[PDB]
Amino acid sequence: ADLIKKKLPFRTRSKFPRKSECVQDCAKAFTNGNKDKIKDVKSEFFSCYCWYE
């Protein structure tokens, strides 16, 4: 229901991760690996922004 924005708390493997990479890492970081609970992502320099419920 409720959406929230967090920065990835660790580095990505890729310098510029694509959407699938950020979804994977965001789910790993915040939703116990549940990719379905990741609602939005944004690519950054060795990082992602994650929007999840």
Q: How far apart are CA 23 and CA 40, in angstroms?
A: 8
Which of 5, 7, 11, 37 contacts a copy of itself by CB under 8 A?
A: 5
Q: Counting beta carbons within 10 angstroms of the beta carbon of residue 2, is it exposed (0 to 12), middle (13 to 18) or buried (19 or more)?
A: exposed
Number of H helices, E strands in the chain: 1, 3
Which of 9, 10, 11, 14 contacts a copy of itself by CB under 8 A?
A: 14
Confirm or reject binding of residue 45 to a copy of itself (CB under 8 A). no
- Using CB under 8 A, list all residues that contact a copy of itself: 1-5, 13-14, 18-21, 24-25, 27-28, 32-33, 35, 39-40, 42, 51, 53
